[PDB]
Amino acid sequence: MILQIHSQNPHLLDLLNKNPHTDLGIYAKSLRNGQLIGNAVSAYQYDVVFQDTRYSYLPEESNQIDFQSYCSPLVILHICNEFFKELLQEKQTYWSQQIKWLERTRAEVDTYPCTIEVKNLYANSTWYSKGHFMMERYFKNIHITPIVGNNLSLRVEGKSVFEAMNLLSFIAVTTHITNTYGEYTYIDDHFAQKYARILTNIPQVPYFVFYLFIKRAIKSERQFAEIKPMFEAYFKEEGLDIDFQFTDTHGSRMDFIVKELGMEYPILDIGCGELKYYRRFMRRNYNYSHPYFATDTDKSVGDYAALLKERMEADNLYFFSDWTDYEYKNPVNIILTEVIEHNTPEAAEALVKHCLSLNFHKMIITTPNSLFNKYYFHFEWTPQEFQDFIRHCVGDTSLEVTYCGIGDRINGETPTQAVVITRK
Amino acid sequence: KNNTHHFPKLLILVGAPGSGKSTFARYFIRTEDNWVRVNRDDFRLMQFGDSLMSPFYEERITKMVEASVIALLKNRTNVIIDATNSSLRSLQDMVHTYTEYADISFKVFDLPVEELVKRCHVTQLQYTKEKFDFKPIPRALKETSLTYADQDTSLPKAVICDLDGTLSLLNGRDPYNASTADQDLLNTPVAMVLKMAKQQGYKVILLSGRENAYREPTERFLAKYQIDYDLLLMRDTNDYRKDNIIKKELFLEEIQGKYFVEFLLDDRNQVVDMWRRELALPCFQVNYGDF
Amino acid sequence: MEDKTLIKKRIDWFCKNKINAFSPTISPAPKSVERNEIESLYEGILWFVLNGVKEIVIEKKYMGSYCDIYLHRRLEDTYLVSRNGYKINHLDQEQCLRALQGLHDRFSWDGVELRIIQSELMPWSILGKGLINNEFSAYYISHEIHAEYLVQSSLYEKLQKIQQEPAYLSFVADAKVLSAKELKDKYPMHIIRQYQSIRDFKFLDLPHYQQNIQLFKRQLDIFGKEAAPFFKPFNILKEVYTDGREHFVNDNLSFQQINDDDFLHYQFTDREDFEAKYPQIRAWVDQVNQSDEEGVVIKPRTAFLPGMPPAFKVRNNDYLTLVYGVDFEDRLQEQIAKRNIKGKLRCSINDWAINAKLLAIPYSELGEENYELKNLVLDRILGEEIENQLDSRL
Numbered sequence A: 001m002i003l004q005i006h007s008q009n010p011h012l013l014d015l016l017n018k019n020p021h022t023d024l025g026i027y028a029k030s031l032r033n034g035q036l037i038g039n040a041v042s043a044y045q046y047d048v049v050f051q052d053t054r055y056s057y058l059p060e061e062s063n064q065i066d067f068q069s070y071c072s073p074l075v076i077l078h079i080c081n082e083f084f085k086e087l088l089q090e091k092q093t094y095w096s097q098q099i100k101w102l103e104r105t106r107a108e109v110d111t112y113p114c115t116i117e118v119k120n121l122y123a124n125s126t127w128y129s130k131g132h133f134m135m136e137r138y139f140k141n142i143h144i145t146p147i148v149g150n151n152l153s154l155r156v157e158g159k160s161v162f163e164a165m166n167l168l169s170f171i172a173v174t175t176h177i178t179n180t181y182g183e184y185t186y187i188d189d190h191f192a193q194k195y196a197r198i199l200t201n202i203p204q205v206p207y208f209v210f211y212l213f214i215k216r217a218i219k220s221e222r223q224f225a226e227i228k229p230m231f232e233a234y235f236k237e238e239g240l241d242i243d244f245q246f247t248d249t250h251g252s253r254m255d256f257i258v259k260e261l262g263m264e265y266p267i268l269d270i271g272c273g274e275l276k277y278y279r280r281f282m283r284r285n286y287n288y289s290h291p292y293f294a295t296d297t298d299k300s301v302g303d304y305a306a307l308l309k310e311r312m313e314a315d316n317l318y319f320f321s322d323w324t325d326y327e328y329k330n331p332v333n334i335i336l337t338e339v340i341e342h343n344t345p346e347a348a349e350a351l352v353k354h355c356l357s358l359n360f361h362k363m364i365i366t367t368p369n370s371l372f373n374k375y376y377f378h379f380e381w382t383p384q385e386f387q388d389f390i391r392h393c394v395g396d397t398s399l400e401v402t403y404c405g406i407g408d409r410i411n412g413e414t415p416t417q418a419v420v421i422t423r424k
Numbered sequence B: 001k002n003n004t005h006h007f008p009k010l011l012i013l014v015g016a017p018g019s020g021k022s023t024f025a026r027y028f029i030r031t032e033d034n035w036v037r038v039n040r041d042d043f044r045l046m047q048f049g050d051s052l053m054s055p056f057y058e059e060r061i062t063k064m065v066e067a068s069v070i071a072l073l074k075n076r077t078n079v080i081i082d083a084t085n086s087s088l089r090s091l092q093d094m095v096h097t098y099t100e101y102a103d104i105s106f107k108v109f110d111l112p113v114e115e116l117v118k119r120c121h122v123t124q125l126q127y128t129k130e131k132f133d134f135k136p137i138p139r140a141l142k143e144t145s146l147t148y149a150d151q152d153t154s155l156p157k158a159v160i161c162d163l164d165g166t167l168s169l170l171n172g173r174d175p176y177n178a179s180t181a182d183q184d185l186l187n188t189p190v191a192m193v194l195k196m197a198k199q200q201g202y203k204v205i206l207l208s209g210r211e212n213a214y215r216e217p218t219e220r221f222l223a224k225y226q227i228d229y230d231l232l233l234m235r236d237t238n239d240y241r242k243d244n245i246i247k248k249e250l251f252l253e254e255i256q257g258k259y260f261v262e263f264l265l266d267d268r269n270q271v272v273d274m275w276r277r278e279l280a281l282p283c284f285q286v287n288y289g290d291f
Numbered sequence C: 001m002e003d004k005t006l007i008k009k010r011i012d013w014f015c016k017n018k019i020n021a022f023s024p025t026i027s028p029a030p031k032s033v034e035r036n037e038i039e040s041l042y043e044g045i046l047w048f049v050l051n052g053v054k055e056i057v058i059e060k061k062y063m064g065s066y067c068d069i070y071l072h073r074r075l076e077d078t079y080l081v082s083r084n085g086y087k088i089n090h091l092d093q094e095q096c097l098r099a100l101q102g103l104h105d106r107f108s109w110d111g112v113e114l115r116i117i118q119s120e121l122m123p124w125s126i127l128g129k130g131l132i133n134n135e136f137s138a139y140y141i142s143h144e145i146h147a148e149y150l151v152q153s154s155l156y157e158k159l160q161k162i163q164q165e166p167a168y169l170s171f172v173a174d175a176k177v178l179s180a181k182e183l184k185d186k187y188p189m190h191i192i193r194q195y196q197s198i199r200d201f202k203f204l205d206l207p208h209y210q211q212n213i214q215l216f217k218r219q220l221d222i223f224g225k226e227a228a229p230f231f232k233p234f235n236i237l238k239e240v241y242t243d244g245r246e247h248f249v250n251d252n253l254s255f256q257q258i259n260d261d262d263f264l265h266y267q268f269t270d271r272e273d274f275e276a277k278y279p280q281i282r283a284w285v286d287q288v289n290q291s292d293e294e295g296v297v298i299k300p301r302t303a304f305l306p307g308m309p310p311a312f313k314v315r316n317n318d319y320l321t322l323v324y325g326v327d328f329e330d331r332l333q334e335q336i337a338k339r340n341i342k343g344k345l346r347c348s349i350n351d352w353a354i355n356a357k358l359l360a361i362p363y364s365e366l367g368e369e370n371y372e373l374k375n376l377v378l379d380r381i382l383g384e385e386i387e388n389q390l391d392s393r394l
């Protein structure tokens, strides 16, 4: 790893917490196998090198031809929180702070444009499908030069040293969590809340990046809860009320459907590649005593039903294609978690009206939120559209209807919608 | 109907030696999911030998093959079976023995005799006379056609009860020493049948596999729990022949043609079979037998 | 792999496609610490001679992709099978057929239906570009850049100065020579850190480190260039006659027949006149080495001997610079200790022995209802599954 930092600022070397007089302007420290050497080649230019013996960044195990030590976004990640840590402090705490030999605060010395360059970075992902780097879309200061294969070189521009350095670390942490090292792709459990703040120390990171970092980097429900407020507070400052949740929309969904419906009434699964089924005998845990009905137009699903009945565990599973093969005349809980928009449009009203005739106790329906699509990178309803749909088929009857959204919430808008129709 | 309902499968490989059925099966059980192979030849290899044996051994090998297949089929395990058999008397029998337990299927392995003896034997063609048509045969039951025996309905209504282990549980007692039999405990549900039995015109006949020598300790047990009975039929003293033999004699000599048996209550299988299978009479089985 | 349902897929595909051989892993030749050669030409021949194999062939070793050529008489309907079990069909059917008439023209197809011949499909980048790009070129570049920087910059100069100053040395004396886990702690690691981080820096013989990078670059530039498709055929497996009958060739000397007017090699080293003959064979493999080749392959003359492996590969040290790092040349004693070809060899053997068993099924009978085929494939497949877990530099 090789990292040059420029500015025309006279007090650069000051800001980086380094003394140009001390041992020729070198600052050394062991990294892993190891040795990281910071270098004042002058003011106006600092040069971090990372040497290595062997296997500092890619397991000795891999019988591979290893060169991560020379370009892994992680070496950068370390070099930040090990040479330039105070630089990555915080908006308030940094700008308003003394200097070793004061000439006012940081807000006075660090006002000169800073350029920082990486000789060799490695980005093996969708976020660098060749030509360009995906964060270039969202940060105009990032400058890529391809070298070969998945390797590139970085040049980071900033109005301040703080601005520049906090982008490099944003690059490093986003690039790393979206990157496969191949079989050795791994993230420790202490990773989040060692870097989780980098996403909050640069000022226009999109919501999708936060989601990504939550789902790929925060290993423990316990630790998600400790970062959750830092994230949310950041988005408040940026002008968005965002809830955030560890579990992932799906399944965060499946969770909701389970806890709501409960095990006391036989299920009628409407759109099913079978996953809702399994979930309903999570071992004995839910001592599910009833049979279990499923339907689907898909020939493919029709057949898979039977592949479980020739036979693996499909003991109380009854699957039907024609709707007059369903004869069960007792109370049922009933499920529609995609289905209504996956397609079959406005026959969607036909389908659900059919259900409301069927002796049920509780229904749940689910569709994408649409107002959510802004937040990422076969029709689709807004809640007004959806709420209108429920209305004009459940209408004029004595059914109790209750709404709620599932998944991360941004200004009241989740990415998934749900109704719970309860017959009195 | 309308409903889905599945039973395990029995796949009968039918064919000559060298025709490649054991090869298919090795591939099959290794790639399919829930299957167990049963080979007759592998069996007679526990008994050490080349693949024909004493009519004693081969009858015993049959007893084992059948037990195991049923054992597994009952367990919902699919069974492939390596029929060296190949005949018709075998096949049709094979089918009889099995279909009721599972859905039978067939896979033939035909192969030119010029090619067949090139799997190196004994130059001998087999009964391959494409008979029967090897169409798959779903599970069949045969028996809800219950048909008793034509007993003279003039003779007086009567029921029949076993003592040992049916109206009179042992509670530890030695099976063959029914001297201590006045300590025995009452299987009340049976006792309750015999009660309501004699409330209608029914003669209640006790028929027991006890040495007649133990008659006294028995009548004690009976009057102790207030059992209202007409006859008490007992095994001859020093007899010792099997239960069903001595009970059947007892039945034909006494009960038969003098009474009209409305049903019987008994415990052990050996006897239940006789009643049902030989004498063609309704017999209810009170507990589990298999002594 | 092991999912019954999808191995079942793969096999079915192998049957429908009419494939008649698989392929073997090929082991390195056994090492000689004596000769300080990690894969030893000597040892691999000796290995063969002491197992009774006394007629052997030595071919050049082509840096390409393994390709079983199913040459039909109607050239247009030939096909290609990969290293493992799969048909190769993503090349320009013309460009290929064209590169195959060279071979086709060396035969006479009177009553001959088909000739399964194994070859190396060349060059490497036809199937290996991007493995070339993403891995090799990447690894090269990384070191080149790093090397360049250590040459141009003031880093090495400033480190050798501090490594003279009086403050330093004092540290390296009264800590190497004096032993305590608190020989006081000269300011909060402050200098314990810094002075220990220096000296524990790995200097590099910068012209050597460059010359070694250049070796790697050289090697990459021999084998890694693109890419007019062609073939090096090296053994005929079986021929099949319209006649109905087939011919299991089983002669690794079929080489000079099927293309490769390239120098084969052939000794009847019988009763250790090998040892007298070894030095010639060595001199010859050195030409092949001093030429621009990966190296050589040692095979028994009879392609399939029972219990015998199919070949030993013997790659030259320069080329192995592509497999192990730039410093493979230096770390030889290390990397040789590390090497263990038993088990690679074990698989090499079974693979080849299955393969003969596969070839044994007549072409006319490859199909989905041939369960001797199917077991053999599943057998080979389980073998794949095992042999893949090995050093992977073999």
Ligand SMILES: Nc1ncnc2c1ncn2[C@@H]1O[C@H](COP(=O)(O)OP(=O)(O)OP(=O)(O)O)[C@@H](O)[C@H]1O
Residues within 6 Å of the ligand: B015, B016, B017, B018, B019, B020, B021, B022, B023, B024, B084, B119, C361, C370, C371, C372, C373
């Ligand atoms: N399609 C085929 N092509 C070539 N050889 C085959 C083929 N199928 C089976 N064989 C070989 O034929 C020989 C006999 O096959 P197999 O063991 O299946 O006989 P079998 O029908 O089980 O006879 P048995 O009644 O003794 O079990 C085996 O060695 C097997 O490898």
Ligand SMILES: Nc1ncnc2c1ncn2[C@@H]1O[C@H](COP(=O)(O)OP(=O)(O)OP(=O)(O)O)[C@@H](O)[C@H]1O
Residues within 6 Å of the ligand: C024, C025, C026, C027, C059, C060, C061, C062, C063, C064, C065, C066, C067, C120, C234, C297, C311, C313, C394
């Ligand atoms: N003359 C030859 N005879 C046999 N194989 C050759 C020859 N020349 C080149 N080869 C190729 O060499 C391969 C083995 O050498 P190499 O080490 O380059 O391959 P590999 O990718 O490691 O395969 P494996 O791991 O199966 O040995 C064979 O699979 C074959 O493709």
Ligand SMILES: Nc1ncnc2c1ncn2[C@@H]1O[C@H](CSCC[C@H](N)C(=O)O)[C@@H](O)[C@H]1O
Residues within 6 Å of the ligand: A270, A271, A272, A273, A295, A296, A297, A298, A301, A336, A337, A338, A339, A340, A342, A343, A344, A351
């Ligand atoms: N009108 C209809 N009646 C029955 N099934 C329908 C239907 N319209 C669509 N479907 C089926 O419903 C399925 C929904 S896919 C939904 C899978 C699951 N609920 C999830 O969480 O992702 C589709 O496979 C589709 O074939």
Ligand SMILES: [Mg+2]
Residues within 6 Å of the ligand: A181, A182
């Ligand atoms: Mg890698």
Ligand SMILES: [Mg+2]
Residues within 6 Å of the ligand: B162, B163, B164, B165, B166, B266, B267, B268
């Ligand atoms: Mg009894």
Ligand SMILES: [Mg+2]
Residues within 6 Å of the ligand: C062, C063, C064, C065, C066
């Ligand atoms: Mg090769």
